[PDB]
Design an enzyme around this catalytic site. Structure first.
Site, PDB file in Angstrom:
ATOM      1  N   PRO A  48       0.564  -1.424  -0.321  1.00  0.00           N
ATOM      2  CG  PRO A  48      -0.785  -1.412   1.788  1.00  0.00           C
ATOM      3  CD  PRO A  48       0.248  -2.544   0.741  1.00  0.00           C
ATOM      4  CE  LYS A  75      -2.965  -5.025   0.536  1.00  0.00           C
ATOM      5  NZ  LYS A  75      -2.870  -6.291  -1.037  1.00  0.00           N
ATOM      6  CB  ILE A 104      -3.341  -4.881  -4.687  1.00  0.00           C
ATOM      7  CG1 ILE A 104      -2.766  -3.659  -5.753  1.00  0.00           C
ATOM      8  CG2 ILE A 104      -4.194  -5.434  -5.392  1.00  0.00           C
ATOM      9  CD1 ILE A 104      -1.235  -4.708  -6.466  1.00  0.00           C
ATOM     10  CG  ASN A 132      -9.484  11.416  -2.836  1.00  0.00           C
ATOM     11  OD1 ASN A 132     -11.102  11.515  -1.748  1.00  0.00           O
ATOM     12  ND2 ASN A 132      -8.865  12.322  -2.984  1.00  0.00           N
TER      13      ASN A 132
HETATM   14  C1  LIG Z   1      -0.572 -10.878   1.546  1.00  0.00           C
HETATM   15  N1  LIG Z   1       0.869  -9.919   0.333  1.00  0.00           N
HETATM   16  C2  LIG Z   1       1.768 -10.549   0.138  1.00  0.00           C
HETATM   17  C3  LIG Z   1       3.428  -9.629  -0.629  1.00  0.00           C
HETATM   18  C4  LIG Z   1       2.258  -8.008  -0.705  1.00  0.00           C
HETATM   19  C5  LIG Z   1       3.162  -7.686  -1.904  1.00  0.00           C
HETATM   20  C6  LIG Z   1       2.677  -6.397  -2.232  1.00  0.00           C
HETATM   21  C7  LIG Z   1       0.985  -5.893  -1.371  1.00  0.00           C
HETATM   22  C8  LIG Z   1       0.878  -5.115  -2.120  1.00  0.00           C
HETATM   23  C9  LIG Z   1       0.625  -3.477  -2.405  1.00  0.00           C
HETATM   24  N2  LIG Z   1       0.372  -2.737  -3.370  1.00  0.00           N
HETATM   25  C10 LIG Z   1      -0.316  -1.624  -2.812  1.00  0.00           C
HETATM   26  C11 LIG Z   1       1.121  -0.397  -2.949  1.00  0.00           C
HETATM   27  C12 LIG Z   1       1.528   0.693  -3.918  1.00  0.00           C
HETATM   28  C13 LIG Z   1       0.325   1.001  -3.831  1.00  0.00           C
HETATM   29  O1  LIG Z   1       0.886   2.880  -4.877  1.00  0.00           O
HETATM   30  C14 LIG Z   1      -1.045   0.003  -4.444  1.00  0.00           C
HETATM   31  F1  LIG Z   1      -1.873   0.959  -5.569  1.00  0.00           F
HETATM   32  C15 LIG Z   1      -0.810  -0.841  -4.004  1.00  0.00           C
HETATM   33  N3  LIG Z   1      -0.929  -3.301  -2.116  1.00  0.00           N
HETATM   34  N4  LIG Z   1      -0.671  -4.039  -1.804  1.00  0.00           N
HETATM   35  N5  LIG Z   1       0.700  -6.729  -1.287  1.00  0.00           N
HETATM   36  C16 LIG Z   1       1.233  -7.955  -0.758  1.00  0.00           C
HETATM   37  C17 LIG Z   1       0.176  -9.177   0.098  1.00  0.00           C
HETATM   38  O2  LIG Z   1      -1.471  -8.505   0.078  1.00  0.00           O
END
Ligand SMILES: Cn1ccc2ccc(-c3cn(-c4ccc(O)c(F)c4)nn3)nc2c1=O
Ligand SMILES: Cn1ccc2ccc(-c3cn(-c4ccc(O)c(F)c4)nn3)nc2c1=O
Lengths: 114, 114, 114
Positions: free
Chosen positions: C1, C32, C64, C97
């Site tokens: 995130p 996360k 995400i 937001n």
């Molecule tokens: C279980 N697991 C493992 C590795 C991982 C690795 C990365 C992420 C992840 C990265 N974002 C993200 C970062 C920057 C942004 O600007 C964006 F919009 C989204 N959201 N999730 N999530 C995981 C995750 O949930």
């Protein structure tokens, strides 16, 4: 609503009252009370438009509703107009991103608007 | 297109030609004329990545079209390469949000592209 | 995130461990891994909220997944509380937001997360 302008125009060229005028014009343009309008002006930025460092601006307008085809044309005429007149930025050196936000995706006062 | 880099790398470490280099490279990558490419670099930022204050970058690429699964993987390689060489940022400390913008939500030159 | 705060509060009012605290609290709130959480704080901004230049903040959270009605209200309480306690900003003068990003639209280390 929330309007942000990022620009390479120096801080001393932003006229006194600029944020108030933006607040007031956007309140009228969106139909939202001025209390709900936020404005953010970022001068002295390192940026370019078409590889030229002449004055330019990158902007966004976020709103819960009041975003669409004809409305965004209207916002663009209004906002490019103000940037040209108050900041001396040519309108073909301005980008504005429009975002129609879902109320559930806008946080405020410890909660969200949904 | 609109490309923005926010980074904790100090201003003196951003080369003078970085904006023009990004412009040209993004123009080739997207197949769009350089005149329409806007680039914005914001140094000296107070940020952290993974809880660490080592050099990092938070970026965004807005475009009408030319955004998608395969293209975005290509863009990340191009942009991580530029950031790694010119700003000495490790590629696993780089985030790029990609936005496929509707032409009706992009204002320019007193109107929108729709 | 990714979490960004833009505020008119001065640089000197940002506590030293504030980036670390946002990282740790957002890991707990989203679940996360902290290694993938980026935080960005931009003070001394020229901004107005509701026409007033009292302390305010405009923020965003990209992730995400982990974005939705109930979660966004929980995030808002967490983040507004953090901005009230650490930056002395009233929650009624904060916007946040939220963006649920597609994994293919988040670039990282020479690829995307798709
Ligand atoms: C279980 N697991 C493992 C590795 C991982 C690795 C990365 C992420 C992840 C990265 N974002 C993200 C970062 C920057 C942004 O600007 C964006 F919009 C989204 N959201 N999730 N999530 C995981 C995750 O949930
Ligand atoms: C072939 N051709 C010719 C002219 C042209 C002229 C303009 C564009 C164009 C501009 N954006 C854009 C800019 C800023 C934003 O913030 C954004 F969301 C989108 N995307 N495409 N594209 C073309 C183009 O593709």
């Amino acid at each position: 609503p929330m309007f942000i302008v990022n620009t390479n125009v120096p801080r001393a060229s932003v006229p006194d009252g600029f944020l108030s005028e933006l607040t007031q014009q956007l309140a009228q343009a969106t139909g939202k009370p001025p209390q709900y309008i936020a404005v953010h002006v970022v001068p002295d930025q390192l940026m370019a438009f078409g590889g030229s460092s002449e004055p330019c601006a990158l902007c966004s307008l976020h709103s819960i509703g009041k975003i669409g085809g004809a409305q965004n044309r209207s916002y663009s005429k209004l906002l490019c107009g103000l940037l040209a007149e108050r900041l001396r930025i040519s309108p073909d050196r301005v980008y504005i991103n429009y975002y129609d936000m879902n109320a559930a995706n806008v946080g405020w006062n410890n909660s969200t608007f949904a």
